[PDB]
Ligand binder design. Sequence first.
Ligand SMILES: CCCCCCCCCCCCCCCCCC(=O)OCC(COC(=O)CCCCCCCCCCCCCCCCC)OC(=O)CCCCCCCCCCCCCCCCC
Ligand code: HEA
Ligand code: HEA
Ligand SMILES: CCCCC/C=C\C/C=C\C/C=C\C/C=C\CCCC(=O)O[C@H](COC(=O)CCCCCCCCCCCCCCCCC)COP(=O)(O)OCCN
Ligand SMILES: CCCCC/C=C\C/C=C\C/C=C\C/C=C\CCCC(=O)O[C@H](COC(=O)CCCCCCCCCCCCCCCCC)COP(=O)(O)OCCN
Ligand SMILES: CCCCC/C=C\C/C=C\C/C=C\C/C=C\CCCC(=O)O[C@H](COC(=O)CCCCCCCCCCCCCCCCC)COP(=O)(O)OCCN
Ligand SMILES: CCCCCC/C=C\CCCCCCCCCC(=O)O[C@H](COC(=O)CCCCCCCCCCCCCCC)COP(=O)(O)OC[C@@H](O)CO
Ligand SMILES: CCCCCC/C=C\CCCCCCCCCC(=O)O[C@H](COC(=O)CCCCCCCCCCCCCCC)COP(=O)(O)OC[C@@H](O)CO
Ligand SMILES: CCCCCC/C=C\CCCCCCCCCC(=O)O[C@H](COC(=O)CCCCCCCCCCCCCCC)COP(=O)(O)OC[C@@H](O)CO
Ligand SMILES: CCCCCCCCCCOC1OC(CO)[C@@H](O[C@H]2O[C@@H](CO)[C@@H](O)[C@H](O)[C@@H]2O)[C@@H](O)[C@H]1O
Ligand SMILES: CCCCCCCCCCO[C@@H]1OC(CO)[C@@H](O[C@H]2OC(CO)[C@@H](O)[C@H](O)[C@@H]2O)[C@@H](O)[C@H]1O
Ligand SMILES: C[C@H](CCC(=O)O)[C@H]1CC[C@@H]2[C@H]3[C@H](O)C[C@@H]4C[C@@H](O)CC[C@]4(C)[C@@H]3C[C@@H](O)[C@@]21C
Ligand SMILES: C[C@H](CCC(=O)O)[C@H]1CC[C@H]2[C@@H]3[C@H](O)C[C@@H]4C[C@H](O)CC[C@]4(C)[C@H]3C[C@H](O)[C@]12C
Ligand code: CUA
Ligand SMILES: [Cu+2]
Ligand SMILES: [Mg+2]
Ligand code: NA
Ligand SMILES: [Zn+2]
Lengths: 84, 227, 79, 43, 259, 98, 514, 58, 46
Amino acid sequence: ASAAKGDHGGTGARTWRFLTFGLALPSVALCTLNSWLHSGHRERPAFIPYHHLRIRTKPFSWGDGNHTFFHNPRVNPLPTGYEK
Amino acid sequence: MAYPMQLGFQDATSPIMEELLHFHDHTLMIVFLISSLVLYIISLMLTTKLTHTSTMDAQEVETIWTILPAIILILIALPSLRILYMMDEINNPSLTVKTMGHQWYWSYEYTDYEDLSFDSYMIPTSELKPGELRLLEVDNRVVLPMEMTIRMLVSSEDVLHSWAVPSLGLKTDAIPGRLNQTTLMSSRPGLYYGQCSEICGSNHSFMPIVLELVPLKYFEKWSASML
Amino acid sequence: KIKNYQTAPFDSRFPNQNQTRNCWQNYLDFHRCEKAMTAKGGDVSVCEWYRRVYKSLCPISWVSTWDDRRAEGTFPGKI
Amino acid sequence: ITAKPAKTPTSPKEQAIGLSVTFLSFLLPAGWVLYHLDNYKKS
Amino acid sequence: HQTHAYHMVNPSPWPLTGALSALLMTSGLTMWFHFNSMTLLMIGLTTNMLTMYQWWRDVIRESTFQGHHTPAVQKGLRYGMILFIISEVLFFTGFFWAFYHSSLAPTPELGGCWPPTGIHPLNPLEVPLLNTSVLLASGVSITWAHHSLMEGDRKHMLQALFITITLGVYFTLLQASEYYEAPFTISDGVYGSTFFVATGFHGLHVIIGSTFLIVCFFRQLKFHFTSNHHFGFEAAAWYWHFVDVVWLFLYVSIYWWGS
Amino acid sequence: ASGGGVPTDEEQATGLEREVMLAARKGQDPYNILAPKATSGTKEDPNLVPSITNKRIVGCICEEDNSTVIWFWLHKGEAQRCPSCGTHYKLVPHQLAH
Amino acid sequence: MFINRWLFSTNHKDIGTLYLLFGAWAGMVGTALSLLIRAELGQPGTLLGDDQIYNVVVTAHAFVMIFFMVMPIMIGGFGNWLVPLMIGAPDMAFPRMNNMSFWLLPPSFLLLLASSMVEAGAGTGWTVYPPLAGNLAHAGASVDLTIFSLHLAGVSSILGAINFITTIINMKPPAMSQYQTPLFVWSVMITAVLLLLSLPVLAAGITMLLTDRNLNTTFFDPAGGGDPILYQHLFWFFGHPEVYILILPGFGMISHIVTYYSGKKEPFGYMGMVWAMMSIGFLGFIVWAHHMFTVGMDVDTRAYFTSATMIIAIPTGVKVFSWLATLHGGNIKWSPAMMWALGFIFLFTVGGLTGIVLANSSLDIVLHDTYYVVAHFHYVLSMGAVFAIMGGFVHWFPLFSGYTLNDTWAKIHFAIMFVGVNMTFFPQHFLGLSGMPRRYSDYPDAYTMWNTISSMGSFISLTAVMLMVFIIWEAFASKREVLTVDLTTTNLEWLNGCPPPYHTFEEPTYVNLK
Amino acid sequence: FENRVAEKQKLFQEDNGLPVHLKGGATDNILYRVTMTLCLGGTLYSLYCLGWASFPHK
Amino acid sequence: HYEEGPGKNIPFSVENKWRLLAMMTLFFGSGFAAPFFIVRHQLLKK
Ligand SMILES: CCCCCCCCCCCCCCCCCC(=O)OCC(COC(=O)CCCCCCCCCCCCCCCCC)OC(=O)CCCCCCCCCCCCCCCCC
Ligand code: HEA
Ligand code: HEA
Ligand SMILES: CCCCC/C=C\C/C=C\C/C=C\C/C=C\CCCC(=O)O[C@H](COC(=O)CCCCCCCCCCCCCCCCC)COP(=O)(O)OCCN
Ligand SMILES: CCCCC/C=C\C/C=C\C/C=C\C/C=C\CCCC(=O)O[C@H](COC(=O)CCCCCCCCCCCCCCCCC)COP(=O)(O)OCCN
Ligand SMILES: CCCCC/C=C\C/C=C\C/C=C\C/C=C\CCCC(=O)O[C@H](COC(=O)CCCCCCCCCCCCCCCCC)COP(=O)(O)OCCN
Ligand SMILES: CCCCCC/C=C\CCCCCCCCCC(=O)O[C@H](COC(=O)CCCCCCCCCCCCCCC)COP(=O)(O)OC[C@@H](O)CO
Ligand SMILES: CCCCCC/C=C\CCCCCCCCCC(=O)O[C@H](COC(=O)CCCCCCCCCCCCCCC)COP(=O)(O)OC[C@@H](O)CO
Ligand SMILES: CCCCCC/C=C\CCCCCCCCCC(=O)O[C@H](COC(=O)CCCCCCCCCCCCCCC)COP(=O)(O)OC[C@@H](O)CO
Ligand SMILES: CCCCCCCCCCOC1OC(CO)[C@@H](O[C@H]2O[C@@H](CO)[C@@H](O)[C@H](O)[C@@H]2O)[C@@H](O)[C@H]1O
Ligand SMILES: CCCCCCCCCCO[C@@H]1OC(CO)[C@@H](O[C@H]2OC(CO)[C@@H](O)[C@H](O)[C@@H]2O)[C@@H](O)[C@H]1O
Ligand SMILES: C[C@H](CCC(=O)O)[C@H]1CC[C@@H]2[C@H]3[C@H](O)C[C@@H]4C[C@@H](O)CC[C@]4(C)[C@@H]3C[C@@H](O)[C@@]21C
Ligand SMILES: C[C@H](CCC(=O)O)[C@H]1CC[C@H]2[C@@H]3[C@H](O)C[C@@H]4C[C@H](O)CC[C@]4(C)[C@H]3C[C@H](O)[C@]12C
Ligand code: CUA
Ligand SMILES: [Cu+2]
Ligand SMILES: [Mg+2]
Ligand code: NA
Ligand SMILES: [Zn+2]
């Protein structure tokens, strides 16, 4: 590819700043728009005690040993189901 | 089984094991040849007062000792690969038997028609009957019909194990969550031994495999009696 | 009927040493078939072949565990 | 290779001592453990 | 006096403190995992930070302040960093191997499918895509920073470098939120296993890379870098590109194809 | 769009880095960064080997592409010859640092 | 001054010395472990206990011999001492990082000894395969301490590899191309590249085992959709390169020893030797599954691994014949080092050929996990790698110390060791063909004869190790200072005296470009 | 900010025979003693923990 | 400057051959004895 733009007569600091503010950051702004839009908490799925999930072969070295490190009560059920 | 002071392979019990014996003879000859040739040349280089310490040219003799070894490798690979694919041929078995490895014994399942299954433990040395082999005998043998193509399926219910019977040229690892297949076919009746071939903990040395090859008729009555 | 089964025959879909999927496939097939038949008002005898094959190939503990899970509602496979 | 004579010559007697001490440093500790092996197995 | 251009380093205690800190951290992890105690781990992490700080401080003293980094010493440092990055690539490779091994032949326990039954993957078009534009953008801004430095522009070098760091931090914060919001955990089978360990090690590298850039930022503030000699910055940029590339592979493999 | 504020090597390089930089500008190589070019190596035109002492190890690659390098100490005084090809080398001692 | 010199070192010779000391000590540990193994197998019945204690011994024996003895001695010791001297460099590229590569080893060793102290130890095999190595079959800290030991040894070697590669590429005289560097230097660089690429994969794999054991991941657990076979791939992807990492520096030293004692100024076919080591290094990365012929792999995959593995014999053959061609027409000096080198050439060839027998997956079905494999690897390691280490040690000892050994004693030492290793391992081929499995504390009665003879052979070897210690003491006790060394024109490392001064090459060598 | 690199270059090139890790002043010495003390003490403690873990507490 | 020459470029002293014998004996002896005692340690736990 060659993109769809042009310069190349000499790639320098002014050119890379042009790209940072004219392409890169605007892209981040658009994606930030898109993301902080399609977000919204999606309805947590019914709990099913599947044996290949919520694995516990040894208790975790923290808390009560039954909660994952970044445990989110709202979406992460315990081996016995969602919390109160 | 192995006998005292044995040098080579246990006598072949299946056609495949026979095949390997000949392939090994073939390869071992080459190994003897090359190692004795190297020992010889070493002694040759070290037994003369004549000298030549100036620069010797290499791009000429290197052709010989690149082409010869390549040819010898091909002479080993051909029969090696022929046997490899032979062991893989479609054969259509008359019977399927499963074996599950456990710490530390094997269990067997013949579930083609009836739901037959049993555990197989090593006979303790203190309980051996006269004339019985230390570390090799089991309480319940794997009775199988001789001269028939059988499908063996191997897995494990805990750690890794490996199901082996040297005389038949068999060794298939027992992996939990996996079902490994191998075919067995004995040319003769008898008792054939093997031992767990994957370190599995405290009694890895003590969980042998004993196969009892009898005529189909006796295999059937044994199956019935074993329900 | 069209049976007279000795053992599960060679299946070209699973020609290698690892037969784990052969067992699993036949177990699924039988239980899928058994469901379609018991549902639409038919006979489970058509599902017989899959039951024989999976019974021959599958370790007792696997079939056992899968059965317990279908009952508990935790069988991960689609039936 | 050429080398000068020993600055502190080690005589045959001295060598027997060094060899004996060396062999003993390997053999005694191990020998002790191995000897009392039965005293260990069941105690 | 020496008549070669290489650096003979003064006897240093850092290699030893670094080695011992390695012993304290591994021992610490074992004590934590098994004897429920973080004491050793804490000391280990502390001596480790202390070792790194002083060791790299000395490297700055030897180069910027004492002038030991002749072109030959700098050439060696280039090979060193390239070789270091290669070993990091092979490390990640083991994790991508684990991912592909599992995902390409899903076992019966997962339902014989991928993603496993019961796993609801994140939408690659949402935060994961945002994270992707953030890292790619930081790749552009750090290139602007490098060119500014080489053209002798202090203000714009600092500006571009700042923007690069902010982006790295943004990625880190977004990933931390993603971790918290994820309906799956590290204990959710091989899916959670491959997901968190791969992205987790990548996240750690992002933090290391950002730290490295921040170090460059302050050294730049203190005029350490000349328009022509700035290896610390070049290495941080190479390392940053590595981190950026590992992400693109994670994104394509785990988030997109693996969903 | 542009400005300054970043030091140059000329303004900030120090220690050995600066020495190498300044010597290189005068076209000199006090820190042996470059491979010296050979003379005809005859008795009359020997290879001049700089040194800061009264002996320096010389490595002679007799013929271009030889993988074997012949090593020997070149001492101050009458020119010595490579034990392998006989080309001549003569030590030209001292100085470097003024 | 003592602490500054030996704890805060930034000198390649002193660091190389620390490495040789560590490695010699590790060798004693590895020897004791090997005697414990053979004492147990010395007669039928159980001596120590069941397979657990026995296998904790077998496991440590391997880790100690491999990671703490061979690698530290060859790469850390001989590598650090000789590489800078052989290219006329003032030191290594990163002399301070070099010191950390060393200091990570004692902690790594301590972690290994710890794992055997706590709980019931790690009786997993040096391959540490799960589920046996998992938190259910091996609950407790033991396997975790083992994993951590490997991590430290791994960081030490990866940093060492970066140092060697940079040093060799960047610090040679301006006129010296890579094709003018000695074969030992080439052997070390290639070894460093293999270490750089393989260790990170092992690190990845064992980290996955650590998380399966402690963070509830299931990479190798079928219950979570994992696979124990995945671990095997990751381990062996590193594991095969590792064996070439263990022999390459040996090949390098053998080339120097044979050339030197043949009174030759150069090894026969230099470029062919370089090509051979590079090919072996390359091929060593695409053959790993030959350690998995019984796990149940597709036939085509097995056919490929059988073929790819065999090809390694070609480049290896060029080396064997080149060493012979180096002897050809030489004024042979029958020194103790040359004896170790000649034993190496023959015994390594034997082990290499049995390795070619094992390459055939068909035959491997029956040979796998039997003593035939143990016979193969001990010939290449306990005869190949060890002989190269002994040869290099006796050859370079005067350089490192400034003193000479008693040649007669060194020849006696060689004779005893030669009988011991062959009596120990040769009968193991028989035990293998006849079916004796690996990792057994006891065996069926038929295997008694060969196991008895093999254990006796191992005692002869112990006698040689103890003698070696005495011999080193005698050298230091008598103090015969070196005067002259022949062939310094083609062995630059000897050119600065014995021992060379702390600082060498302060004024670099002079090399014309022409 | 102002460029003070020249001051730092003079300080670190000062011929006092101090190794680079202490050449900065009395703070270097403090930080060093802190680091080394934690390292050595932590190591002794780890040896203690190993001794503890080596034995069963039934 | 550090001491240089035979017997001076090592971390142990070779001034007295008997003190040296003792050092070497402890050094190598400790390494060789370690496994035996670790084995004894494991047998005496249970
Ligand atoms: C220590 C115990 C010895 C027991 C001996 C046999 C007793 C037989 C009774 C009675 C004998 C007759 C009745 C039984 C016949 C059985 C045939 C069989 O089933 O056949 C297969 C069997 C038996 O093979 C044999 O047919 C035995 C071959 C023995 C070759 C020995 C070379 C020995 C050299 C020095 C002595 C050994 C230690 C040093 C070995 C150094 C490395 C070779 O199994 C093997 O394959 C074993 C060998 C494995 C491969 C090693 C390959 C390279 C080896 C040597 C190259 C040396 C070249 C220079 C020439 C040699 C130069 C030194
Ligand atoms: C370098 C590697 C190496 C070396 C040298 C050895 C040496 C020996 N090994 Fe081996 N061994 C392995 C690596 C090694 N081994 C591995 C990888 C395994 C597999 C483990 C597993 O299955 O998990 C194994 C397994 C193994 C078994 C099989 C165990 C089983 O399956 O149950 C046996 C059995 O006899 C054994 C015996 C021996 C013996 C008697 C020696 C003797 O020959 C030793 C004699 C003494 C020496 C050769 C040491 C000399 C070196 C020095 C002391 C340096 C000296 C100092 C200076 C010169 C500076 N070993
Ligand atoms: C120094 C270490 C070292 C080296 C260099 C090698 C080299 C080789 N090894 Fe080995 N090997 C081990 C250490 C080593 N190995 C270890 C430790 C194990 C066991 C690991 C474990 O399970 O714990 C093992 C296991 C092992 C296996 C697995 C067996 C099994 O577990 O079932 C196989 C499989 O192919 C094998 C093959 C080879 C081959 C073909 C070579 C080749 O590189 C050898 C090539 C050399 C020659 C061939 C000889 C010289 C050549 C000539 C004179 C030319 C003419 C030759 C011919 C034409 C044939 N090795
Ligand atoms: C914010 C993004 C950045 C990620 C890293 C930041 C914080 C975590 C702390 C250290 C992580 C460093 C490396 C990764 C190691 C393990 C994977 C961790 C990735 C992670 O953080 O994964 C988390 C699991 O945390 C866990 O167990 C983590 C438990 C923390 C203990 C760490 C375990 C230490 C093991 C380290 C092994 C070291 C070996 C490395 C060797 C290198 C080469 C020699 C995911 O959380 P969860 O609740 O399960 O799911 C979320 C549900 N809402
Ligand atoms: C599915 C998998 C998932 C995981 C994937 C994860 C990530 C993807 C991979 C990579 C992307 C990451 C980062 C890339 C960005 C920057 C890297 C830096 C490169 C750079 O900028 O290199 C420069 C020049 O090229 C040079 O080095 C050239 C010189 C190189 C020297 C070092 C190499 C030496 C090592 C061994 C040599 C190999 C021999 C080859 C022949 C073998 C044949 C078989 C710097 O100069 P220098 O060192 O002085 O050399 C002088 C030569 N001009
Ligand atoms: C909760 C989310 C968190 C957010 C993300 C986190 C971090 C991002 C961090 C920092 C970056 C933001 C701003 C930088 C601030 C000041 C720069 C100051 C210099 C300046 O003003 O630079 C000017 C341009 O900058 C400028 O417009 C500044 C440019 C701003 C660009 C983005 C705005 C996009 C606008 C909409 C366009 C979208 C349309 C898309 C078109 C297609 C694209 C190809 C050029 O001027 P000069 O006269 O030549 O220079 C003299 C010397 N300075
Ligand atoms: C690379 C260039 C050289 C080209 C040569 C080719 C070599 C490797 C690339 C090919 C990888 C894709 C192949 C996958 C296609 C098959 C799909 C599959 O299914 O393969 C799977 C595994 O593949 C997997 O993870 C594969 C995982 C990867 C393993 C390969 C290891 C090499 C990696 C290291 C290289 C470092 C590179 C640095 C990166 C820039 C599972 O195995 P099966 O045996 O099927 O089990 C199923 C059974 O139930 C029935 O028998
Ligand atoms: C919460 C945060 C804590 C997490 C732990 C890790 C934390 C931070 C790691 C960040 C690394 C910081 C490195 C700072 C290095 C500063 C020294 C430096 O940058 O030194 C430069 C040389 O490069 C050099 O050594 C290059 C030095 C290379 C270092 C890069 C190594 C990265 C470390 C990774 C470690 C973890 C591995 C992954 C884990 C699985 C000095 O030369 P110049 O710049 O040319 O200056 C000279 C001019 O001024 C002359 O005019
Ligand atoms: C379970 C947990 C296990 C934990 C293990 C942790 C192990 C050690 C932790 C402590 C180590 C940190 C201390 C800082 C190390 C910096 C080394 C460095 O920065 O080394 C540099 C060389 O490497 C270069 O450049 C390029 C190379 C930079 C390497 C940075 C070192 C990072 C260490 C981690 C490596 C992980 C391996 C990654 C693959 C998995 C400089 O070389 P020196 O010889 O110093 O100087 C030369 C002078 O001329 C400089 O003026
Ligand atoms: C190779 C580089 C990687 C090296 C190793 C990485 C080290 C990771 C350190 C993790 O340490 C931690 O562990 C904890 C456990 O000890 C936490 O406390 C916690 O754990 C508890 C103790 O039971 C609770 O009291 C609390 O709620 C809390 O979440 C915790 O915040 C966190 O800092
Ligand atoms: C694999 C490597 C091992 C190789 C084999 C070892 C070779 C022999 C070493 C000698 O060792 C010893 O000999 C003893 C017996 O001869 C012991 O004495 C013991 O036995 C006694 C006499 O029978 C008593 O006097 C004492 O109480 C004592 O414990 C014992 O302590 C030990 O030092
Ligand atoms: C003070 C300094 C000017 C050069 C000098 O130090 O003399 C200026 C120029 C550019 C730098 C700034 C850059 O414009 C980028 C950043 C933008 C701001 O929003 C916050 C601080 C910010 C991180 C920087 C802080 C500022 O103090 C800097 C460091
Ligand atoms: C061309 C290259 C280097 C020659 C040089 O520049 O001196 C040489 C070195 C080693 C040679 C190889 C080795 O001698 C091994 C092989 C020998 C066969 O005679 C031809 C191909 C063969 C594969 C050789 C091809 C080629 O001539 C190589 C690769
Ligand atoms: Cu079961 Cu070994
Ligand atoms: Cu291999
Ligand atoms: Mg196996
Ligand atoms: Na025994
Ligand atoms: Zn010449």
